[model samples]
Target: NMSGIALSRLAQERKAWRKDHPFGFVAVPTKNPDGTMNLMNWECAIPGKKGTPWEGGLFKLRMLFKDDYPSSPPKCKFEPPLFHPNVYPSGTVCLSILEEDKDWRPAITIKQILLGIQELLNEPNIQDPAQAEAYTIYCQNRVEYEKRVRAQAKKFAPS
Candidate 1:
């Protein structure tokens, strides 16, 4: 149910992301059931933005592609899970740019998507929240929010 063009596009993107992506960002295709790399699924590591509580840590993420890609975008989620108002317990990122129901595109997508998540690490949205505790702490207690976020970042930092 996937497009070959989309598949190749992802392959192309992998090399591109690997070769020239910003510092502290890396993306690689996940292995398939047959042990072959699957362009539809990618594993990524994005570093937290500088001067943020999430700094000095790496965040792992998983990307799942749709059959209609290029015409449709992939869904992105953190691996160990992110503790943020816009991040679900399931780790799925909640943002207009990543809404599963919406379609957004191209090989240029990898850059935009991952960079957005990096930005979220700095300033999370308060208009709506996915996790109550993180959201409440973030809104009411900046100190506690930094502590917990830094802690979570430490816990998930690459070994």
Candidate 2:
């Protein structure tokens, strides 16, 4: 893959995040066995918003950035997949802004991406669900869905 703007953009993002980023959010580059950093792959965590069922959780995420980055959004996925209507079995997030054909723009930063996902944790887009089970249960019984979300949040609560 070509190493042009993609690498440069990643470097900038790393620096910007280290300097000043949102609270309760974590995003950092992964290191290779040889001790070198891999800018293309990032380890991130999104904290559930306060006052929501997901509030106590710190959902882990892995971001894979392709060489065509900026032009094509990075692939954002939960580490062990999330129990959400918009999260696929493989953990891939189903959001409009993350899709290149949708609201995705090169101007979108890493901070924005994590914030968007955090927002989605509470306000799921049931209309465009990625998991049948979560969607069905969510629409069929509201209490059950909230209960399930609460349980999941507790499982991933901060240490």
Candidate 3:
């Protein structure tokens, strides 16, 4: 994959993210093993929304883009595997906007993806569960679920 269009779009994304991005979010391309910037691979951090059990957490995720980007959505994975029903056992996010045939759109920006994941932290899709551990607890034991979520928040808390 030569990645002509892909390269430019990612560069543009970097510029956009640096110019004006949401509060408490971090999205920057990762460096290659050789020290060059790898636009196709990004390291991101999404802050938990306020007034929620997930609040005070700064969850990290990786966004991997392919040569045919915009035409295809990037693969987003939470580092260290978040304890959320919508997140897979491997930490991959299960969101419609990230799916090819679902709500994915070529016009969607990196900012949108990060914000969407932040929203998912508290407002999980119970109908479409990815992690059984989290889904079952959320469905059966509401109090326990909150306890677990808060614990996770503490683990990812900033300092």
Candidate 4:
């Protein structure tokens, strides 16, 4: 973060996140293993919802922001790509609002985007798949999709 207007907004958001009781992510500047901040990057995981195959699982992602800051949407990539129709092989999410040409707005916050992603976990858009296996199973084999997701959930559960 710089000392310009962008830094002020990011600083404000960081303070807001710090004051919350979060079940998901808080806005901390991602850092190196040696304890240095990577100012414009963040790593986080969404907790699973109860009563779903994703229960007890964590879907991790890295959100990288450009210096344009709030004027542009950030890129979110899941580490170790998941088995989800909306997620690409590289783990990038394919949500419409995340697209600049589609519906991106400078006013949209990280919290809102993450909420959309969490909803997508339970309700995938098969017609707009970014992955084949997950889409195929989700469309044709309901049982397999559930079982596959369950297995994935167990493997990815975070503490």
Candidate 5:
């Protein structure tokens, strides 16, 4: 089953994504004891801004690819939870590209997704917010939003 055309395409896409994006993150290939290859998880460091709220913050993300794959986008979530309007209380991200009904193109590669997520860290989507309170504060007061984001970044900082 693994030798079929689908596996071949998967392998090719995986390689392409890695080769194109060198800075964001890398995915490790693994195989079970039974010899079944699994894409498992892809890891990357969240590149935060220098003078912004997330300064000096190093955030890590894990992306889980389902068997259905291209037909369905991967499940991406932060390892240590995040505080953002687009991110749900459960840690699930709410980016437009990740939305099932949005501009998600099947041709989009893993590298594209990772880059998109990285960009999201800098510019959050306040219109469609996952956390109402966070959105309200961000819209009502920019100063408060930055302060809160800075505090949240510290909370999730790697020890």
Candidate 6:
């Protein structure tokens, strides 16, 4: 059996992360009206570029944490769909931080993870893309990729 550490370290990390990155969004835990914990998860808006194609665009993501806690990484999906090489059609993101094979040290806090995700949005890994079509388009024509991404961003934007 594993150690029953009670997540004290994790809680401390989360508190510090919240303090440092207050402006960044967070997934507030909730409960259903029936008294059940609603873990369907919450969305966090990712900040994008300043004046480029992704500028002024707020990307929402749904994060689902596993019961395994720190032992397993959380699954994050982009909401309203996103047209990115690293983001799947279903909005699931493909990043190293979320990968078990990668060097995802548990010492990394939620703030670090979110910041890493934002950085990934700015610089996608075209080689290991979740959306092959987007990768192909991006590799073939940068302008077209930006155009498509901008269009998709607008579609997900607030009315």
lDDT of 3 by residue, 27-138 (tens): 9998999999999999999998899998899999999999999889999999989999999999999999999899999999999999888988899999999999999999
What is candidate 1's local distance difference test score?
A: 0.82
lDDT of 4 by residue, 1-159 (tens): 343555566666666667763585544577778887665787768877789999889888887877787777888888878899999999999888888888889887777777778788998987789998899989999999999999999998775
Across residues 39-141, which tens digit of lDDT does each residue of candidate 5 receive? 6545556756667787757777777766556666767787666877777777777888886688777778777777787678768886788877778887899
Query: Can you tell me which runs of candidate 1 are displaced by over 4 Å?
Result: 100-108
Every candidate's lDDT: 0.82, 0.94, 0.93, 0.80, 0.71, 0.70
Ranking by lDDT: 2, 3, 1, 4, 5, 6
Tell me each candidate's TM-score: 0.89, 0.98, 0.98, 0.89, 0.78, 0.80
Question: Model 3 scores what on Cα lDDT?
Answer: 0.93
Tens-digit per-residue lDDT, 1-159, candidate 6? 132332454456545755666463554434679885444344567766666677667778876765565676778788766888898999898888887679566666667777787778768896787987888998999989889878766765544
lDDT of 1 by residue, 40-110 (tens): 88898899877878888899999988877776778888987888999989998887677645434353479
lDDT of candidate 2 vs native? 0.94
Deviation in angstroms for 142 in model 4?
1.1
Question: Which candidate tops lDDT?
Answer: 2
Candidate 2 Cα outliers beyond 4 Å, as residue runs: none
TM-score of 6: 0.80
lDDT of the structure predicted as candidate 6: 0.70
Q: What 10-residue stretch in candidate 1 is worst by lDDT?
A: 99-108
Model 5 poorest ten-residue lDDT run: 1-10
Candidate 5 total steric clashes: 0
- What candidate 6 gets wrong by more than 4 Å, as runs, is 1-14, 22-26, 34-40
Superposed Cα RMSD, model 5: 3.1
Candidate 2 clashes between residue pairs 3 or more apart in a chain or in different chains: none
